[PDB]
Structure 1
């Protein structure tokens, strides 16, 4: 059994990750590759071991949010293509080329300036580039086919740069009204047709996130970007209710009870603000998770955890490192008992989706804000490591 000083931990089930990759692979066209999106520490699951597992079981490439995230993966021994999805300052072009990290860009000046930097440095490696086309997300990317053509030309004239992809991002592919997604797809294809009409040969074309991969597998083109689905989580209730691909949640969050007491003497106030008053025979268990771990303070007097297969409520306010839960009057519980904060236990389950609904957010935020001070353990072929 697990030995920790502070007994809170994450379990990432890599067998589920493999099953999730397999389900997406079996759904999308055979020719389409899979780019596993492991930005933000693998959506809080741990980027290194999720990326390693994905590449063993179906993925060809990786996506991250920054050069620094890509370098962490290279230092783990990973040789697969790694795309930075956001903006990379020209200050890191030299470093990105040396680590064989692929950068997104979409402006003539950036292309020309990056080339000149690598020229001046006598760079040993060329820098791989994907062009972002903004078709309605409004975040990053080139927005007109005229300007796109100039960006392509600047990239092609840059001998120290290497064009390896072109992509766009859907902003509402997880919604019931598909109008905007079809307009974006139509616009993207129009831009790509414009380039081909100029005789330009296209590199790897990718546009689908998890939502469009499930709902519009025919848009998979050369490659899709599998993010939330890799982790066994759906991009929206609507996509889940399509019932087209079966995903298995990979992440659980657990702890062991640090202390158990009956509230026999007064005062029976519990936690900050004294917002909860226990009964004289009520049993209160203290757990080593709090809002600095990413367990939202808005779950104060609201959240649930699983103990011995049953939902027991948070009592009083969440504190920075600890919560208290009620085991009820003369409730049964002991120090050391395992508690499930997100996940399954015996018959019961408190899913990340249910926590997100309670907090009026999305599963993406619940998992990707799990603090790095929580250790992560990995299950593969039914057994733990790391």
Structure 2
């Protein structure tokens, strides 16, 4: 199959990504664009190949966490609009314009000072901007309709800026109680109505994350922001249970057994702390993944991997680079056998969602903390590359 020195790797199924984009496309209104959210290295799936695939199969724009993530995509030959969701220091204004990155901003002072930096360097390449309106996320963005007006005016007065969007972020659209979500929607529409009544024409409006796209597709407006769903993962249990859109998981994480041994002699202590004592004929397979790869140490004596289609448990503590599992009394297994850490094997499955449940977190965290040291392979039209 694949040749590696250390035998741990991720497979991202781009056929799955395409199918997710199509399922979402067919769910939200026909005219709505998709902005594929490829922040944090593609939610740990690899920003570039996900971005490239997304753009060919129904996305129009990309979103990222920073200018540096956006430049990564440029250097990969990507020319679609890239929006930085977080805050960008005035330090990087010039660099942003040069690499044609779209920045979010929401403050008069920032817009004017951005304009002055660009006026000095004199480039014809204007800096693209979106305005973030905070309707209750409480994170970034402007909060009253009157400060919003000033921001718009300052942006429109700035000839080295170009306004290409305005947005908000829902903070509870994945929850069974939709009260807050509807209050946010109705505040955002409100602020926009206010702008329209001052004779201001709107650029691209966008508010839905995956959760709201699915539960409130009527909010898609000109463009949705598809993150977790792109990766074939649901924003919550609730959203999944609505059974409105069929997503398929794009990531699996795999490895090969590095060493197998029957624990014939003493001491039969396994791993740091000696927290697991194996039986005399207990078989113990060692695997090349650990907590510095993003495989939580809280999975010590708790997690489960797949080997020849069955669940075999983590025995003893997770270490920095390796774990051990029990194949049981006289269990069969060889050096080189393929193991799935996240995903499917035969008819068994250990989803990223089950892993997040074990660890009292969410699927976003389990994928987006997968270390860059784990190489990514991509599957397209059923076959593997770079």
Give yes or no for TM over 0.5: yes
SS at match of 1:68: helix
Determine the C-alpha separation between the residues in 1 that align with 2:5 and 2:339. Answer: 16
Query: CA offset at residue 195 of structure 1?
Result: 0.4
SS at match of 1:295: coil
SS at match of 2:86: coil
Unaligned runs of 5+ in 2: none
Question: After the TM superposition, which parts of structure 1 deviate over 2 Å for at least 4 consecutive aligned residues?
Answer: none
Determine the C-alpha separation between the residues in 1 that align with 2:19 and 2:284. Answer: 39
Query: CA offset at residue 73 of structure 1?
Result: 0.2
Deviations 1:112-135 (A, max 9, x none): 000000001112310000000000
What is the aligned-residue RMSD (CA, Å)? Answer: 0.3
Query: CA offset at residue 376 of structure 1?
Result: 0.3
Unaligned runs of 5+ in 1: none
Determine the C-alpha separation between the residues in 1 that align with 2:347 and 2:201. Answer: 55
SS at match of 1:194: helix
Determine the C-alpha separation between the residues in 1 that align with 2:376 and 2:60. Answer: 24
Alignment of 1:325 with 2:343, yes or no, is no
Count of residue pairs the alignment pairs up: 386
Partners of 2:124 and 2:160 within 8 A in 1: no
Determine the C-alpha separation between the residues in 2 that align with 1:110 and 1:142. Answer: 12
Determine the C-alpha separation between the residues in 2 that align with 1:71 and 1:95. Answer: 10
Partners of 1:8 and 1:374 within 8 A in 2: yes
Determine the C-alpha separation between the residues in 2 that align with 1:199 and 1:347. Answer: 59
Alignment of 1:228 with 2:228, yes or no, is yes
SS at match of 2:91: helix
Determine the C-alpha separation between the residues in 1 that align with 2:83 and 2:373. Answer: 27
Query: CA offset at residue 249 of structure 1?
Result: 0.1
Normalized against structure 1, the TM-score is what? 1.00
Determine the C-alpha separation between the residues in 1 that align with 2:66 and 2:309. Answer: 41
Determine the C-alpha separation between the residues in 2 that align with 1:158 and 1:381. Answer: 46
Partners of 1:104 and 1:130 within 8 A in 2: yes
Determine the C-alpha separation between the residues in 2 that align with 1:316 and 1:356. Answer: 20
Query: CA offset at residue 258 of structure 1?
Result: 0.1
Deviations 1:146-187 (A, max 9, x none): 000000000000000000000000000000000000000000
Determine the C-alpha separation between the residues in 2 that align with 1:220 and 1:273. Answer: 52
Normalized against structure 2, the TM-score is what? 1.00
Query: CA offset at residue 51 of structure 1?
Result: 0.2
